[PDB]
Short mmCIF file of all heavy atoms in Angstrom, two decimals:
data_model
loop_
_atom_site.label_atom_id
_atom_site.label_comp_id
_atom_site.label_asym_id
_atom_site.label_seq_id
_atom_site.Cartn_x
_atom_site.Cartn_y
_atom_site.Cartn_z
N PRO B 499 54.77 34.13 -68.41
CA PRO B 499 53.35 34.03 -68.79
C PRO B 499 52.67 35.38 -68.95
O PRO B 499 51.98 35.85 -68.04
CB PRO B 499 52.73 33.23 -67.63
CG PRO B 499 53.87 32.48 -67.05
CD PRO B 499 55.05 33.38 -67.17
N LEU B 500 52.86 36.01 -70.10
CA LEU B 500 52.21 37.26 -70.45
C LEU B 500 51.10 36.96 -71.45
O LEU B 500 51.32 36.24 -72.43
CB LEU B 500 53.21 38.25 -71.04
CG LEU B 500 52.72 39.68 -71.28
CD1 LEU B 500 52.42 40.36 -69.95
CD2 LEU B 500 53.75 40.47 -72.07
N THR B 501 49.92 37.52 -71.21
CA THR B 501 48.74 37.21 -72.01
C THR B 501 48.83 37.88 -73.38
O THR B 501 49.03 39.10 -73.47
CB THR B 501 47.47 37.65 -71.28
OG1 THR B 501 47.39 36.97 -70.02
CG2 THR B 501 46.23 37.32 -72.11
N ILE B 502 48.67 37.09 -74.44
CA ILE B 502 48.72 37.59 -75.80
C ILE B 502 47.39 38.28 -76.11
O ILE B 502 46.35 37.62 -76.22
CB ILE B 502 49.00 36.47 -76.80
CG1 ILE B 502 50.35 35.82 -76.51
CG2 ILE B 502 48.95 37.00 -78.22
CD1 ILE B 502 50.58 34.55 -77.28
N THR B 503 47.42 39.60 -76.24
CA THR B 503 46.24 40.38 -76.60
C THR B 503 46.51 41.16 -77.88
O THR B 503 47.63 41.19 -78.40
CB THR B 503 45.83 41.34 -75.48
OG1 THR B 503 46.88 42.30 -75.27
CG2 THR B 503 45.56 40.60 -74.19
N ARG B 506 48.59 44.44 -77.15
CA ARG B 506 50.02 44.19 -76.98
C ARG B 506 50.69 43.85 -78.30
O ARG B 506 51.90 44.02 -78.44
CB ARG B 506 50.23 43.08 -75.96
CG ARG B 506 49.84 43.47 -74.54
CD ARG B 506 49.94 42.30 -73.59
NE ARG B 506 49.53 42.66 -72.24
CZ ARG B 506 49.40 41.79 -71.24
NH1 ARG B 506 49.64 40.50 -71.44
NH2 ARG B 506 49.02 42.21 -70.04
N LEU B 519 45.39 27.44 -72.92
CA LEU B 519 44.66 27.36 -71.66
C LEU B 519 43.33 28.08 -71.82
O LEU B 519 43.01 28.62 -72.88
CB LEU B 519 45.47 27.94 -70.49
CG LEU B 519 45.65 29.46 -70.35
CD1 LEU B 519 46.02 29.78 -68.91
CD2 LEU B 519 46.72 30.00 -71.27
O1 LIG C 1 49.36 39.44 -69.03
C1 LIG C 1 48.81 38.84 -67.89
N1 LIG C 1 49.32 37.70 -67.44
C2 LIG C 1 48.79 37.13 -66.35
C3 LIG C 1 49.33 35.92 -65.87
C4 LIG C 1 48.80 35.31 -64.74
C5 LIG C 1 49.44 34.00 -64.29
F1 LIG C 1 50.32 33.59 -65.25
F2 LIG C 1 48.51 33.03 -64.10
F3 LIG C 1 50.14 34.20 -63.13
C6 LIG C 1 47.72 35.91 -64.07
N2 LIG C 1 47.10 35.35 -62.88
C7 LIG C 1 45.89 34.56 -63.02
C8 LIG C 1 45.74 33.47 -61.97
O2 LIG C 1 46.20 33.79 -60.67
C9 LIG C 1 47.43 34.49 -60.57
C10 LIG C 1 47.65 35.61 -61.58
C11 LIG C 1 47.19 37.10 -64.55
C12 LIG C 1 47.73 37.72 -65.70
N3 LIG C 1 47.22 38.88 -66.16
C13 LIG C 1 46.10 39.52 -65.48
P1 LIG C 1 44.54 39.29 -66.48
O3 LIG C 1 44.39 40.47 -67.41
O4 LIG C 1 43.35 39.23 -65.55
O5 LIG C 1 44.64 38.02 -67.28
C14 LIG C 1 47.74 39.44 -67.24
O6 LIG C 1 47.23 40.65 -67.74
#
Side-chain angles (χ1 to χ4, degrees):
Chain B
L500 188 67
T501 301
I502 299 169
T503 63
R506 292 174 182 173
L519 74 159

